Amino acid sequence: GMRTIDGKKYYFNTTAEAATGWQTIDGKKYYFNTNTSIASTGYTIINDKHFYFNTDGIMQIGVFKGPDGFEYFAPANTDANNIEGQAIRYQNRFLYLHDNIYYFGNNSKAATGWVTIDGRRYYFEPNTAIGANGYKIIDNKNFYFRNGLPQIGVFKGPNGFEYFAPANTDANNIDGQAIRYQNRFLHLLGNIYYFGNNSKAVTGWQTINGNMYYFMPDTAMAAAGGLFEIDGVIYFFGVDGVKAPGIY
Amino acid sequence: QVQLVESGGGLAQAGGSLRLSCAASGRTFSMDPMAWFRQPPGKEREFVAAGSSTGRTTYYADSVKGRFTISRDNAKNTVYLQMNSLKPEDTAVYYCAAAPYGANWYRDEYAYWGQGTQVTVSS
Amino acid sequence: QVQLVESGGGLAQAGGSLRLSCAASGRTFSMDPMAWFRQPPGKEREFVAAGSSTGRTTYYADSVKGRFTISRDNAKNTVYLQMNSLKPEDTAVYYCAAAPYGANWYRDEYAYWGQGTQVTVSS
CATH class of the missing domain: 2.10.270.10 (Cholin Binding)
Structure with a gap:
């Protein structure tokens, strides 16, 4: 019963009541606001914990921007028994997901732009926090990156x-x-x-x-x-x- | 709760081959790089191999390069070490590891470590 | 800001040796060929030796071949000239040079030059 009513996603269970709360629909997790029954999109606070959903309401796992910068929305049980998709503490270290590299600071936020780590200068893409790769023009200067490192x-x-x-x-x-x-x-x-x-x-x-x-x-x-x-x-x-x- | 469990170790003979498995439980590792380290008799633990979840990025220690290959099955939360052309010098306790947090995957900075398993190559 | 600074000059005698060093500062020369030239009294500057940053490829003027050896230490950002079996005709100001931009290392077209150091060989 997934229908996009006025640009907003609801799920009717076949019930005058659109579903609320955590719903797994065809292997994908959604959260329907308990007041409005709308599928959460973007950075979302749920019971004082932080999650991220794409524009279709699908809960994402990875590194995504919230109002405090890029957070690691982690698989269940990565830190402090976090539930799936919840942003976690992840401090002063590299994070590797698939073939992407991130660096996380003291605030558990991923670095963007130029940063120095152990005396090496890296660049992480402002739009994704992912290590730069290939040709790049930054502040009118040309660079050629590999794994975030200027070559x-x-x-x-x-x-x-x-x-x-x-x-x-x-x-x-x-x-x-x-x-x-x-x-x-x-x-x-x-x-x-x-x-x-x-x-x-x-x-x-x-x-x-x-x-x-x-x-x-x-x-x-x-x-x-x-x-x-x-x-x-x-x-x-x-x-x-x-x-x-x-x-x- | 999280555990990495190695299996498929034990005895083999020089020139032979062996495949180690490491099954992870308690969380999904389908995005994390997974790796192998080994502790030879009377020596410090050393890097063997590491690879990304897609297999597109892999590294090998100079001593196993061209003889060992790392691979995964992500549905099974499992990493493998295919060991070919085994040498007596490959005798060691083999450890799998996952989710490196250092500047490179050669460094022993990994969020999760296995139990280690004995591989003994004779003759 | 970039400087090449020669040292190891002096007065020595025929059959003897000297060892010149050229310490670079201000940029890294670890990918650049580096070379030695000399200016004998009343004569123009002439090529002495050149070599790649790995040391795998070196060239010598006919006059010094076998007697002189160029080498480098990339970690110290320095190039050396070992001068054996010295002849009076080796008397000259010696200049180190770096980053050639001509067609080959023989041509005196180098991006950076030292200020030179005196070598004198008495009979």
Whole structure:
């Protein structure tokens, strides 16, 4: 008897009375307000304990925002014999759910934005509290994240490959911040890159100083130090990435 | 109330294989990473393997890398350690653990620990 | 703010040795090739040695090959030049350099340079 009357969910048991209280309907938990019989949605207080329901009234388990920030709405019996879905004390530690990472502070709220934990700087997405992954622009600075940690190196963004550099490489950049790096080679950890006028690493076939190079489309690293098959054709590249004339 | 119970341990011979199970009860672990540690004779407990609930993130200690694989059955609240190419040096008390709270899963910072089970690899 | 500071210079004699160090501060050079150049009296600066951050790839000027060894300690953010079997022709100001931006490590195109230290080898 689930019907959406005026944008509000009620459940009639087949009774002039719409159900109230905790209801499990088709393996999903709902709470119908005892005054109005409406299915709770969003952050909800029930008997002085805190729960979270999605817009359909389905009780959620995980990390969701209430008026005091992101709380861990935990499986039953995670802390202090909590009932299923109830927000719990969870202090000064990481939380791992599925493939997501959170960090919880002294207030049992998940960190959002930039935070330092054991001398490492992390970024957790303000919208979800989930560890940042992939390319990100924050306060006009470009970063490339993995598991909440800014990565250092050359990675593909929406405008091509950027140099996400160690701190203080250019214009007092922050660790992992993309930097201006124009019309120059970058030699980084046994790999070679060439950066054009827009500070992006070039890819594919290039002629630089009269020498030919091929920069791998997936990494922007020069083919170097051996024979490489490119588009069904074997070429030979010097240790410096310079292509030797001929086919092999 | 919460308990992790290892089973499937005991004797095996070098080059052979064994699968350990760890069944969790008292709460659902279907979102939590689960892991294995081992305490070799006369040595400190050490990390073996850990993995997320989806299996998409897994780590292995250098000593078991390419011989042991971790897997789960979430409906059964259970984690497995498939041990292949067993060596005498794999002899140890094997512990499962769940819901790590440290900066990485190699660190022995886990909300829940099993009872440990003996694995003895001979010859 | 970023500085490369050479040390280990002095007066030594033919057949002897010196060991130069170059301590970097202000940024980490642990991914960058680092190199040594020298300026002999009345002559231009010339390449001496270069190497990768892992030390797996090193290059030497013909004149010093076999006698000089470049090495690094990434944890200390420092590069070294072990100078054995010294010759009078090794007399020069020695400069450390870091983060080459030219096509190869031989070209004197490096993002950072030290201020140099005197090495003198008497007959």
